[PDB]
Design a protein around this nucleic acid. Structure first.
Lengths: 1320, 81
RNA sequence: UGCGCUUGGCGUUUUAGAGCUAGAAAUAGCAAGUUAAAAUAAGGCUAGUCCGUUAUCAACUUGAAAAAGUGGCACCGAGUCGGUGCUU
């Protein structure tokens, strides 16, 4: 028997269906394995697979950088201890051994209980001479007297453990740390970006105004005071971003919503990346200087004090000001507000001073607590101003120390060693060895320095010994590791595959996208196409079409945009040599620099790769050329742009400046050049989530063909999902487009008629303000309030191309106001309103495609080329990822060659678009309500197989548009008829009305309301076989969508991830917490809480019970956590025997991953969520009539159909209310059967009988809410009108033990039922 | 506010949050409380957004229906602010 | 898309920083608080300044692994699959 396979691929669901020649799904009896009674089961050949989405590896990497963090920061202390250990045992022989044991309790500690000195006498005296380490760290800098070597280590180990940031490369100079010199660096970068509107802060006292001791607002506003723009300006936001505020870059860049940035937050570096994604990466150099400037501000807040050690003394002043103010605060609370002294200074739980110090409140949570308390108290001045200045009772270690450079911790370090160098000999010897431990930074181009066992390492070593910061220069090969660093971190092109891509800011890459954009404009030619480049792009970074229209079409030519070449303009302002850039001989020189400024950020490797260029220019040109790095990567390789050639003797880029084509390679070469399946799915341009979807889609195919007796199908139709689609962004984008388009026209429609954004969801109301309140065809106004009797018209009608988007809708007085033709509006309608459409256009109210289609009659109408293109938009899948997936199947099914050795394409892999099925549904009323059940993925895959097979059987001459392989391409007149039904079943022509989904229609509707009849039997005159029957085939599609058995299978997966929640909880007497170390019991140390369950195990053994210690056979359901999995899989008996189990049977131990299926009584099923909770495992199969009824009733207003079609739809809901009482009848019987949540079913049935008088759409949109009670998976809450039905979960995992364990395949056809009642 | 701000605010609360069915399917947010079976999923509805249900379920207090989930409704409450 | 690499700042935990008083197991009344070590997935080894939250999947049999192997067709039905032939 012949058959086809339909598939719907998604990020977390793969649907499938099998159709025969008659568009029906068949059924087969499958063998049920196991110990059950049932040895046969009948299952239809349609179903879906639901799996959890594939996760991105970002969370894994961010944890790995933290693992390498504490590993290497520890070794920087081991470096100090290993250096000190020898000559230090003289002084103390148990100092270090008390440090690594400082975490243990008195009972567990092997040494004395006091770290530094060991006894309680010399320790408390230290904490009073130096209460903070910054007290001692300053003393070890000023005094020339010998200090205890233990105190020397503690100071050095402190500034080495927490050494500070490496944001600055060399030493600290005023032009990298001072406010005045760094402020000017910001204003200079802002200027270059905007010219003839720049700020010029000529006379401004920068330091004594911006870096004063005042609030974050009293300093930003005081800055602009000596600057007569305002605070809302872009520069005002950069200063607000630098001073620590949270500005909004929306109104400045005119975004769709708000994009707020905060430098102190943990999310700035990613929230900012989303800003450059829209505003363009050209602003990244500007926001960098703001971050560069902000750290100079925060440092002055710390370094409040000319020699000695500024930071520690500043931290000592912060210490003393804390004491004098706390004594000030205590005396006020102890003599003015005598009550609540314990609430502020003793409570710990209400964010007082105790919550500030002992109970976990941040500096801001404590400021907001005493802010109403201080203001309600006299004498609180000099304190409230400090509280507002964010400088009150500050703890010495706060969140803003990220602005402390490591050179500050290097000055105090070198000062301590220098004034102790002449006392201890090894401190004189290792004065550089200790110094280099701090100053060293493992480079980017080196990374992990493994010896061979690491999938991330790439670095080679010059001499295979041990690596330290001091021998890194001698042991590490800087060139070989960096050469592999480039070779690995680069990602090759798709089109060429071993040719490396280009940096996104490359010259030859910027030149390419410049020409690709220019070569498709027209109102071109090769003559001054490059003269535009030379006169427009090569001098002005921004080519406002205004610039082109008058600085090129006036000055030159005859009197009457987007991406550019930024790197050209960027490199221009540096070297000031235009002959250098325009010269095509120095191109390889310009490319390796951008390559070097994109890969590396190191001081020495940049020179080693640019010292070859250190003779082209010298000094003042090089230093500026180095301190300017580029980021990002392009998508093309140089061999594709200026490398390949089709024999013309000209490459792709050469064609762009003469004989334009665009990147629509054809007339072939780009695709002219076996593995494992794990490797084919690995290198696809898709997220890891969809890569899993492809893998399950290949497995579901290999099992469908094995069921069919290893008989490969006829055709395989493929449909994907387009992931990460997923309100305040949409309806505001409409207003942002409506607001600007009105201001351009200047007509006051918003003032005369205000509208809220939520009211734009009305398709007609949106079209009103889209048309400036005017008819699209008539000069007459529009009604505002009588939009009901006024119609929306499709410019290019549905008869030619099914388009229901805004750029093809208009709003007129009536349908007949567009003309009498079946085409676009005629020249009569054009002439009257064409001048006003351009008025709409320049305001960006209508698109240029909407304008081109409205004025198509002026150019003759709809050309055959415009018709043939409409067939491409309906049939050709533009995504590259879908083509690579169909390749995986065509290379798997069609793997047979003849003896002439061609390839026997057995199967035709068809690739359809997601619109053809959704259009097929909403046309012939096969509506879809996804909230009912998971069956729609199988229905979308079944309808895909029908539309795919019915197309190739009806229009075989178009196989080279969606089927995979080298076929004939055809042309325009090769299938497009001349006009009307000319050459109807005569010549090779076949199409006039270009909507290829018309041969399914019973009656085609034109634009002028005319009728074009179509037969009931659809044939193909070139052969004659029946391809579709509007009388007998539609019921088959309706019967297939109505059958209640669909192989719904949740994929079982062993959990993988963290061991538990990462809250290092405090200690407690319970054994529930997880030991943080093998000896640190949570009973006296505090550990992790709530472990995650990898999988579960059906244990079957005997345990000790009763006071007699006898044995008792038991069957349990123990959960194996992730941390326990390593040992349980190594020795399950010796591990289970540690939990009181004895006499364990290993052949009856069952591995139960998540979502394990269990069936009980009356067909009610349960899925195993964990060892102590269950999920709902049943699906509710409503028939096809209710899905059509629930959809039409829910969308009673927004039907998106003709009033001749909406009549039947609205009367179908108003003549079939009893379905509402019928639908609620089944959910009740389905919940009284398998859901087993009776109390929740009480309210939904009572709330339904109340609202029997509510409008039709009211109950519908709330009955769809009701399926949440009966949906598969975990229980969830929902709201049927006002009654909030709360969920009833399943914590009783006991009934599962005596049930039937359904071990089912990926396709659900192959089962293996294990009746667990026979276990024991 | 923006759903991404919700997933971050509950990740900071130690609960292991996946945004499932984000590809022409009905979107839902899975909060894995307990790390042992109990998952409070909230699917999107055309009428009510995913964060409008997060408030209408955790705004006015712990809903008092289960021992096991309390530290939760309490911690999810601090995010409605 | 994806995927890698470098660095910092807080945090949290346990211990150290001795508490003093008139008080019986309740608790008042005072004085204090600002940071230090150590851990920062348990840990695994080849002991590397290296790996350890991604991917990868039903059951059963074979295998270290990579993987190979295991389930008749047709009609008439449809509340999750039946009921009804043919063949061995």
């Amino acid at each position: 028997k012949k058959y086809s396979i339909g598939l719907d691929i998604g990020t977390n669901s793969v649907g499938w269906a099998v159709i025969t020649d008659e568009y029906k799904v068949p059924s087969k009896k499958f063998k049920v394995l196991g110990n059950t009674d049932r040895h046969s089961i009948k299952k239809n050949l349609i179903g879906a697979l639901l799996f959890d989405s594939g996760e991105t590896a970002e969370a894994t990497r961010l944890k790995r950088t933290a693992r390498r963090r504490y590993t290497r920061r520890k070794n920087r202390i081991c470096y100090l201890q290993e250096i000190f250990s020898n000559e230090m045992a003289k002084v103390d022989d148990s100092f270090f051994h008390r440090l690594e044991e400082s975490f243990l309790v008195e009972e567990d500690k092997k040494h004395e209980r006091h770290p530094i000195f060991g006894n309680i006498v010399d320790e408390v005296a230290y904490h009073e001479k130096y209460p903070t380490i910054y007290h001692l760290r300053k003393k070890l800098v000023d005094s020339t007297d010998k200090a205890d070597l233990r105190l020397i280590y503690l100071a050095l180990a402190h500034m080495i453990k927490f050494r500070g940031h490496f944001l600055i490369e060399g030493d600290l100079n005023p032009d990298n740390s001072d406010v005045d010199k760094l402020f000017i660096q910001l204003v200079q970068t802002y200027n270059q970006l905007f010219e003839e509107n720049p700020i010029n802060a000529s006379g401004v006292d920068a330091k004594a105004i911006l870096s004063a001791r005042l609030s974050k607002s009293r300093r930003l506003e005081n800055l602009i005071a000596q600057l007569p723009e305002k605070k809302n300006g872009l520069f005002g936001n950069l200063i607000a971003l630098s001073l620590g505020l949270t500005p909004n870059f929306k109104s400045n860049f005119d975004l769709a919503e708000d994009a707020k940035l905060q430098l102190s937050k943990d999310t700035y570096d990613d929230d900012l990346d989303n800003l450059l994604a829209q505003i363009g990466d050209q602003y990244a150099d500007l926001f960098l200087a703001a971050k560069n400037l902000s750290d100079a501000i925060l440092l002055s807040d710390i370094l409040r004090v000319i020699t000695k050690a500024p930071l520690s003394a500043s931290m000592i002043k912060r210490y003393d000001e804390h004491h004098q103010d706390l004594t000030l605060l205590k005396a006020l609370v102890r003599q003015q507000l005598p009550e609540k002294y314990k609430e502020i200074f003793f409570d710990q739980s209400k964010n007082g001073y105790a919550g500030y110090i002992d109970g976990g409140a941040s500096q801001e949570e404590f400021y907001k607590f005493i802010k109403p308390i201080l203001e309600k108290m006299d004498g609180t001045e000099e304190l409230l101003v400090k509280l507002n200045r964010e400088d009150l009772l500050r703890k010495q270690r706060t969140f803003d120390n990220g602005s402390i450079p490591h050179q500050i911790h290097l000055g105090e370090l070198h000062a301590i060693l220098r004034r102790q160098e002449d006392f201890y000999p090894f401190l004189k010897d290792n004065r550089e060895k200790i110094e280099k431990i701090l100053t060293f930074r493992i480079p980017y181009y080196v990374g992990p320095l493994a010896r061979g066992n690491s999938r991330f390492a790439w670095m080679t070593r010059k001499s295979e010994e041990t690596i330290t910061p001091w021998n890194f220069e001698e042991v590490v090969d800087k060139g070989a590791s960096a050469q592999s660093f480039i070779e690995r971190m680069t990602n090759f092109d798709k089109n060429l595959p071993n040719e490396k891509v280009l940096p996104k800011h490359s010259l030859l890459y910027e030149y390419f996208t410049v020409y690709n954009e220019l070569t498709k404009v027209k109102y071109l030619s090769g003559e001054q196409k490059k003269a535009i480049v030379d006169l427009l792009f090569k001098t002005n970074r921004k080519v406002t079409v205004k610039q082109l229209k008058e600085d090129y079409f006036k000055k030159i030519e005859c009197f009457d945009f987007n991406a550019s070449l930024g790197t050209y303009h960027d490199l221009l302002k540096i070297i000031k040599d235009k002959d250098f850039l325009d010269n095509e001989e120095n191109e390889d020189i310009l490319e390796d620099i951008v390559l070097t400024l994109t890969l590396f950020e190191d001081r020495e490797m940049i020179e080693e790769r640019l010292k070859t260029y250190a003779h082209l220019f010298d000094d003042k040109v090089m230093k500026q050329l180095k301190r300017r790095r580029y980021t990002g990567w392009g998508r093309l390789s140089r061999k594709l742009i200026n490398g390949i050639r089709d024999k013309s003797g000209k490459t792709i880029l050469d064609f762009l400046k003469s004989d334009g084509f665009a990147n629509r390679n054809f007339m072939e070469d780009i695709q002219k050049a076996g593995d494992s399946l794990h490797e084919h799915i690995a290198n696809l341009a898709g997220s890891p989530a969809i890569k899993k979807g492809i893998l399950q889609t290949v497995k579901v195919v290999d099992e469908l063909v094995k069921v069919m007796g290893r008989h490969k199908p006829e055709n395989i139709v493929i449909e994907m999902a387009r992931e990460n689609q997923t309100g305040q962004k949409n309806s505001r984008e409409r207003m942002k487009r409506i607001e600007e388009g009105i201001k351009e026209l200047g007509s006051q429609i918003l003032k005369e008629h205000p509208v809220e954004n939520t009211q734009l969801q009305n398709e007609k109301l949106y079209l009103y303000y889209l048309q400036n309140g005017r008819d699209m065809y008539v000069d007459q106004e529009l009604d505002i309030n009588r939009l009901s009797d006024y119609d929306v018209d499709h410019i290019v009608p549905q008869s030619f191309l099914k388009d229901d988007s805004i750029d093809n809708k208009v709003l007129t007085r009536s349908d007949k106001n567009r003309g009498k033709s079946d085409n676009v509006p005629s020249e009569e309608v054009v002439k009257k309103m064409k001048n006003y459409w351009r008025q709409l256009l320049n305001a960006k109210l209508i698109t240029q495609r909407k304008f081109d289609n409205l004025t198509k009659a002026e150019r003759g109408g709809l050309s055959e080329l415009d018709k043939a293109g409409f067939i491409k938009r309906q049939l050709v899948e533009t995504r590259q990822i879908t083509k690579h997936v169909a390749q995986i199947l065509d290379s798997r099914m069609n793997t047979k060659y003849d003896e002439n050795d061609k390839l026997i394409r057995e199967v035709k892999v068809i690739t359809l678009k997601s619109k053809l099925v959704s259009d097929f549904r909403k046309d012939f009323q096969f509506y879809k309500v996804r909230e009912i059940n998971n069956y729609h993925h199988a229905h979308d895959a079944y309808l895909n197989a029908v539309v795919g097979t019915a197309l190739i059987k009806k229009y075989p001459k178009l196989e080279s548009e969606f089927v995979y392989g080298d076929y004939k391409v055809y042309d325009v007149r090769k299938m497009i008829a001349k006009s009307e039904q000319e050459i109807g079943k005569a010549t090779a022509k076949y199409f006039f009305y270009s909507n290829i989904m018309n041969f399914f229609k019973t009656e085609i509707t034109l634009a002028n309301g005319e009728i074009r009849k179509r037969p009931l039997i659809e044939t193909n005159g070139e052969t004659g076989e029946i391809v579709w029957d509007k009388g007998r085939d539609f019921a088959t599609v309706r019967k297939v969508l109505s059958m209640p058995q669909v192989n719904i299978v949740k994929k079982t997966e062993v959990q993988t991830g963290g061991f538990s929640k990462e809250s290092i909880l405090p200690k407690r007497n319970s054994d529930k917490l997880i030991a943080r170390k093998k000896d640190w019991d949570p009973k006296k140390y505090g550990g992790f809480d709530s472990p995650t369950v990898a999988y579960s195990v059906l244990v079957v053994a005997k345990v000790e019970k009763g006071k007699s210690k006898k044995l008792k056979s038991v069957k349990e359901l123990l959960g194996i956590t992730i941390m326990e999995r390593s040992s349980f899989e190594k020795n399950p008996i010796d591990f289970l025997e540690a939990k009181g189990y004895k006499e364990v049977k290993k052949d009856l131990i069952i591995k139960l991953p998540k979502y394990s299926l269990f069936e009980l009584e009356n067909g009610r099923k349960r899925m195993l969520a964990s060892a102590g909770e269950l999920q709902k495992g049943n699906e509710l199969a409503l028939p096809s009539k209710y899905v059509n009824f629930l959809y039409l009733a829910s969308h009673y207003e927004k039907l998106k159909g003709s009033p001749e079609d909406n009549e039947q739809k609205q009367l179908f809901v108003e003549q079939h209310k009893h379905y509402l009482d019928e639908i609620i009848e089944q959910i009740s019987e389905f919940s009284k059967r398998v859901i087993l949540a009776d109390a929740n079913l009480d309210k939904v049935l009572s709330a339904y009988n109340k609202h029997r008088d509510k409008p039709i759409r009211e109950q519908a949109e709330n009955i769809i809410h009701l399926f949440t009670l009966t949906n598969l998976g975990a229980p969830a809450a929902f709201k049927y009108f006002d009654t909030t039905i709360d969920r009833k979960r399943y914590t009783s995992t006991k009934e599962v033990l005596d049930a039937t364990l359904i071990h089912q395949s990926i396709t659900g056809l192959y089962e293996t039922r294990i009746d667990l009642s026979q276990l024991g | 506010m923006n759903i991404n701000d919700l997933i971050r605010e509950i990740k900071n609360k130690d609960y292991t949050v996946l945004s499932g069915t984000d590809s022409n399917s009905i979107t839902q947010l899975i909060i894995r409380v307990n790390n042992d079976g109990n998952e409070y999923v909230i699917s999107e509805s055309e009428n009510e957004s995913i964060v409008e249900k997060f408030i209408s379920a955790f705004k006015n207090g712990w809903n008092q229906e289960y021992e096991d989930e309390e530290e939760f409704y309490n911690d999810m409450q601090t995010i409605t602010l």
